[PDB]
């Protein structure tokens, strides 16, 4: 089937330039037009640029005039986005869209997954975590809520895990989105914990761990 | 540029109810409106083009119709596959431009969020920072209002929220805030103050800690 591929995204500061690539194949990639459209972190959708299948004309956002550069090699089968200049302001996933038909008005019909670019001056890094137990403790419900805070990371690309003492994962988890803070992540994660005695007795803690490209890492969180 | 305008903005909706979300344009685009569906994580399928021809495999549940400045996008019967974000795109001109998305939610019964608050661990108050966490459980619908209260005192600027996708086993939500503070400014208050003001609540409850006294 016709599958579009992007790659190039990565972690980059301001000033700094990037490349993206999209591979094409299923479909006659030179007998259609190519498009880039980006989608900031939890934002809509926001179109990037444009060539034609001859590569004669090529039409860019106000925002990346002259700053991104938009080209392909036909024989390859490949879409290129040069991307210079970086600002905070291009950080989202980037998706190559192909066009339905030759007519100026074609909608996209094939999108790719994408690629996350994230531009921070901050540098990329693994997360700082630290446990969030509740004051005095959730006595008054039928579960205790312990939390895991991990923060200071880079890019955004996390995933919580959580063990009970005894080595086992923990189903009562909630994940909860990053916010930005100053060029760096943070996100929480929560579990929920049966108070009605088992609370803790023998468990004296569970494990909260967080994958990240730049390194996993784990903490000890209270009962 | 031509400015395109969605509404609704979100729409709480049940299997079998009839969709409609609008878009319309700051200039006449003449037809050439598209409609992209977008699932978290996914990427954008196209369902709509020229306002109203159906892209090859979308369900003729999906129709649009419009022209000049006002479109819309109606799903006849809501399945459960339907409940995504919505895009609509004017073709027209270039810079080609895309509304601000439609969410289609599941409804739901009302929920009240089980309120929490954690105090910063003592490691992270050694290192300089505090964060004060205040998490909302299980609520619905989506709008609640998290406000951070330091020794009765309204806090804003310092405060960052995080709702999480409509939970695929009950259709609520769960909010985080986070009141981050420099561990100086942190000691020289007591009170730490979570207002949540819900929906579902005749009351805002507040949650709070004095510090120090866990």
């Known amino acids: 089937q016709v599958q579009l591929v992007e790659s190039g995204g990565g972690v980059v500061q301001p000033g700094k330039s990037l490349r993206l690539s999209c591979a094409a194949s299923?479909?006659?990639?030179?007998?259609?037009?190519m498009h880039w459209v980006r989608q900031a972190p939890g934002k809509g959708l926001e179109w990037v640029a444009l060539?034609?299948?001859?590569?004669?004309?090529?039409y860019y956002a106000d925002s990346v005039k002259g700053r991104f550069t938009i080209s392909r090699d036909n024989s390859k089968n490949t879409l290129y986005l040069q991307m210079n200049s970086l600002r905070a302001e291009d950080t989202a996933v980037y998706y190559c869209?192909?066009?339905?038909?030759?007519?100026?008005?074609?909608?996209?019909?094939?999108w790719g997954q994408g690629t996350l670019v994230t531009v921070s001056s901050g540098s990329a890094s693994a997360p700082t975590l630290f446990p969030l137990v509740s004051c005095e403790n959730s006595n008054p419900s039928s579960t205790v809520a312990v939390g895991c805070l991990a923060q200071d990371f880079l890019p955004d690309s996390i995933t919580f895990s959580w063990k009970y003492k005894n080595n086992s994962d923990i189903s009562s988890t909630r994940g909860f989105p990053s916010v930005l803070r100053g060029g760096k992540y943070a996100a929480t994660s929560q579990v929920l914990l049966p108070s009605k005695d088992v609370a803790q007795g023998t468990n004296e803690h569970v494990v909260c761990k967080v994958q990240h490209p730049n390194g996993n890492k784990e903490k000890d969180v209270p009962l | 540029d031509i400015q395109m305008t969605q509404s609704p903005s979100s729409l709480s909706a049940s299997v079998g109810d009839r969709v409609t979300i609008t878009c319309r344009t700051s200039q006449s685009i003449s037809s050439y409106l598209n409609w992209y569906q977008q699932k978290p994580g996914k990427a954008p399928k196209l369902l709509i083009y020229?306002?109203?021809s159906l892209q090859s495999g979308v369900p003729s549940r999906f129709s649009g119709s419009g022209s000049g400045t006002d479109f819309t996008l109606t799903i006849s019967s809501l399945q459960p596959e339907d409940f995504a974000t919505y895009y609509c795109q004017q073709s027209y001109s270039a810079p080609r431009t895309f509304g601000q998305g439609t969410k289609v939610e599941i409804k739901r019964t009302v929920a009240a969020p089980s309120v929490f608050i954690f105090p910063p661990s003592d490691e992270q108050l050694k290192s300089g920072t505090a964060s004060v966490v205040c998490l909302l459980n299980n609520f619905y619908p989506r709008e609640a209002k998290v406000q951070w209260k330091v020794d009765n005192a309204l806090q804003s600027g310092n405060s960052q929220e995080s709702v999480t996708e409509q939970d695929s086993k009950d259709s609520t939500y769960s909010l985080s805030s986070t009141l981050t503070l420099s561990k100086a400014d942190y000691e020289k208050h007591k009170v730490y103050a979570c207002e949540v003001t819900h929906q579902g609540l005749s009351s805002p409850v507040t949650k709070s800690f004095n510090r120090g006294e866990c």
């Open positions: 060539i034609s299948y001859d590569e004669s004309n090529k």
């Open positions: 869209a192909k066009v339905k038909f030759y007519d100026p008005t074609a909608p996209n019909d094939y």
């Open positions: 020229a306002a109203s």
């Open positions: 299923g479909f006659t990639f030179s007998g259609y037009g």
